[PDB]
Design a protein around this ligand. Structure first.
Ligand SMILES: O=c1[nH]c(=O)c2nn[nH]c2[nH]1
Ligand SMILES: O=c1[nH]c(=O)c2nn[nH]c2[nH]1
Ligand SMILES: O=c1[nH]c(=O)c2nn[nH]c2[nH]1
Ligand SMILES: O=c1[nH]c(=O)c2nn[nH]c2[nH]1
Ligand SMILES: [Kr]
Ligand SMILES: [Kr]
Ligand SMILES: [Kr]
Ligand SMILES: [Kr]
Ligand SMILES: [Kr]
Ligand SMILES: [Kr]
Ligand SMILES: [Kr]
Ligand SMILES: [Kr]
Ligand code: NA
Ligand code: NA
Ligand code: NA
Ligand code: NA
Lengths: 295, 295, 295, 295
């Protein structure tokens, strides 16, 4: 046999960091979950019980904490790039570092209409994520995303004109509920190394803000022909707004809300124009995916 | 043997309702998960295979949908009271209905600074709940709550002066992180029936808003001596603000954030005044509970 | 205001223990999750920032580990009794200790038909639990349970003869699927203290084994008239087999499996006697509860 | 912009099927969760609101049920191949079908030492899965796996000889706990179509049984130098036992169990040879991955 691929490291590393402005008293918090997996000249750890090539996962954990103490943890694209660059530079035999970061929301509280200096709320389970692949001699590949952004519109969604054959029961509709959990990813141009990442730092927060704003506005305003058509509009607008993005990917469940025919009970009218009460369906769910790039 | 207690019904009934103002075009959505369990002269269904006393759980489900079509679903205290009253009035042999409702957030989106007429975001996993126990001849007992309200403050929490003996390792602290998931319950005066509930309807939304506001402000502003001391302040203020509440209950995890001593690595200082990077602990967690009533 | 009830402590304490027979080489493992909440003369911690009455939750955690090192962790009824007795004896002002234990399965592997001395499998997510309430001057109240025991029978379940009115759509059936997650609790006679618990130690494992055996056999063999009727048979048999049990409680979801009418497609027959393919329903679910005691 | 990749379909389709031997009375059950995502000449559904190219996800759901009624659902590799072949054959413009199946355990109960004809237990949360990619003109690519197989050994695991530098705190050990959740995947030789899959049908159940047996025996018997070394032994043995497998992949968390130093309390000895009570760590966790192929 032989090792065809191998990577290893530490997953599920929870990290908090606080910044304290000792002049204003304003504190700012950051919380993430980090995974770092390494690749390199490590096959003998698998084939010959050769632990000498292993940077222990415990040491990778220590390194995450140390790196967070010594550097900014925001934007996550930068932190992940710093962290991944450390492992390929420090260890000659390590040739790739794959850094995944999930950023958790801690939004400053407003108390009596004033932002509080040191109190925060988890205002959504929505995450901001990065995948940063630092590959020796091949630069830094970053995928940024938002996920867990759960939305619903109560009208201005349609679905008609689809293929109809002997497997089809679905009725056409000109007015339905549309709800999803948005998972949106933007793939950056390859960066040559950490200097190039640092040169673009403001673009990371700005492009996440653009992606989120476009997602929400297009969802709210598009009189949707399908999930497919609406998500494509989101992607095209994000590409138009940031030239350093190569592709935008969406992965969207269609979280169905079924009408409930109540006409069997006292002639109650609860379908079509009279539909008020619906049954949210936990499963199954449509799942619609697109990757959009330039033409 | 004999049946000492019995209740049965339908759990996990997902319900959506929309309101459409056909004059303004503004739509408003409501989503909940409902459980209804009944009690009464039902023991023979258990002891003698006598299904004649069973209102089928499927029929209880149907009834939840029908009741949502025929009545307001807000405030949940009212909906639950309507629903529970239906079962004890409709069925002579049913003597109690226990209605639990979890309300899911669908907050109207603001698009370009204007509230959108029909688009919503799940802006938090925080729930608003009710437990409505409708007991024939004994009125309606309501417990209202908020849950899943996750908060953190980065300073202005202390914990010193606790008992120290041979089981104690914990260091006293005058400056720590405090984070919790708030579960706060207010117990209403017994209501004699549905008329009395309806007579107090505006108090339900107002008291939930008070409970939430007091929770957030007291958490943010109290230089906390302990979870115990802070939560008591919340409860006392809520009781002072609504005379129709008899008790307030809090159940709070202390979601610990541990300092990380990095002095083994290059003398890095990350404890005490220099603490910036922390390890959030998933488990174990302190769990602190109080029920507060009038003196 | 005043404190009407209060309890506090440490939840979600994960504990492993190994026993090593250094003569045979056979190792045996135990894994649990423990919660200990204390009550007593603690109100001033809530009302006056008086931490002197607080046995820190961190110290409660330490105590759980220490107690596991110094005593058997099995049966859980005994461990919980030891642990709870410690807090009310050690601390004059602590008057109750509420100990919850969830026991996780680690079943010894059989390798080439021989039990392995030190390798284990999590052979089910089924738990064995205890709730041990140690109350100074009032002894030790134990509730034992099994939970998460998920079963299905493909026939020999019926449901007919239930109440039919204008809310009813459910068809009677003489042959359906029945599936549930068993939560079964047996409540012991009050014990006067730890000596009395210890005097009954073999009964704990024997009664858990009886409860499990009766559950499985009655589920498998009863041509069920309803969940209600079948669960009552389980409870009555357990009471008949252990006189030191006062009550048995079951809480059972009816995890519905719906027929799928396929007659719209090529006349396919998939209902009634021809039903082969079903749609498991995630929600809603019936929920049926009984507490059975002696007559 | 332009569509670079697109796939869509129905996820989370729960399916049960029963087989009834009407001669012996023995019933056998199967339960799965299915996802089917299609690719093909579908870009205009995204770019031009052209729903004519969409086989509705609802219709894909119907098709899963119909296919389960008309064909065996076991082995899952065969069912998935049938299902995926249907979509690329039925629809000229659909060129790939990606079928994921998770198989849930329903193990026949033994009652009084005899297998019961129609009662089953979910004896583990362990899954058997397939990923079947049916690509028009490119055959059928199958990845089979087992997942959620949770194991622990209490000794005969070591970890020493790893890289030690200024980031390292981990102590070498010659005797530790090892616990993981096994995710093991075997990748089949490409099949030309459904006939070739059918020609190998017995190999699917046999190779899953081999993979599971080798996993358990190697875990139990290897005096492990590392997760890396042990998992490689598993993979090499599986490749040696089935020539129609090209690669074996393992993904293994190292679910850490930490010693607890209790020497601060009464000199209690709970480390090294005296270690009995451990703290299972929920997070972080090592994560170790290998893909092994022939040399
Ligand atoms: O927007 C939708 N897209 C689809 O592909 C689909 N299929 N059924 N319903 C659907 N809704
Ligand atoms: O606020 C707190 N309350 C307690 O009871 C406690 N125990 N350890 N830490 C604690 N923090
Ligand atoms: O066993 C059952 N019990 C019930 O109470 C019920 N109601 N609907 N179906 C049911 N099945
Ligand atoms: O088996 C192990 N492999 C590793 O790579 C490792 N790192 N820390 N501990 C470890 N244990
Ligand atoms: Kr962080
Ligand atoms: Kr969308
Ligand atoms: Kr609702
Ligand atoms: Kr608090
Ligand atoms: Kr244990
Ligand atoms: Kr049952
Ligand atoms: Kr199935
Ligand atoms: Kr392993
Ligand atoms: Na390198
Ligand atoms: Na009644
Ligand atoms: Na005491
Ligand atoms: Na085709």
């Amino acid at each position: 046999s032989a090792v065809k691929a191998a990577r290893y490291g530490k997953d599920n590393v929870r990290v908090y960091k606080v910044h304290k402005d000792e002049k204003t008293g304003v504190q700012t918090v950051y919380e993430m979950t980090v995974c770092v997996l390494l690749e390199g000249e490590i096959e003998t750890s698998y084939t010959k019980a050769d632990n000498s090539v292993i940077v222990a996962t415990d040491s990778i954990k220590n390194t995450i904490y140390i790196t967070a103490k010594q550097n900014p943890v925001t934007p996550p694209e930068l932190f992940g790039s710093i962290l991944g660059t450390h492992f390929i530079e420090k260890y000659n035999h390590i040739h790739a570092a794959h850094v995944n970061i999930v950023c958790h929301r801690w939004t400053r509280m407003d108390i009596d209409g004033k932002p509080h200096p040191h109190s925060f709320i988890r205002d959504s389970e929505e995450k901001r994520n990065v995948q940063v692949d630092v590959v020796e001699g091949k630069g830094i590949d970053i995928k940024s995303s938002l996920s867990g952004l759960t939305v619903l519109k109560s009208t201005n969604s349609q679905f008609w004109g689809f293929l109809r054959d002997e497997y089809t029961t679905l009725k056409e509709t000109w007015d339905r509920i549309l709800s999803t959990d948005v998972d949106a990813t933007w793939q950056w141009k390859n960066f040559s190394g950490l200097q190039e990442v640092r040169s673009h730092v403001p673009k990371f927060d700005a492009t996440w803000a653009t992606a989120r704003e476009v997602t929400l506005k297009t969802f709210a305003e598009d009189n949707s022909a399908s999930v497919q058509a609406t998500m494509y509009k989101m992607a095209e607008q994000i590409l138009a707004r940031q030239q350093l993005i190569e592709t935008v990917e969406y992965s969207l469940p269609n979280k169905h809300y079924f009408e409930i025919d109540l006409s069997w009970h006292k002639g109650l009218q609860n379908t079509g124009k009279n539909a008020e009460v619906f049954a949210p369906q936990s499963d199954p769910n449509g799942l619609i995916k697109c990757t959009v790039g330039r033409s």
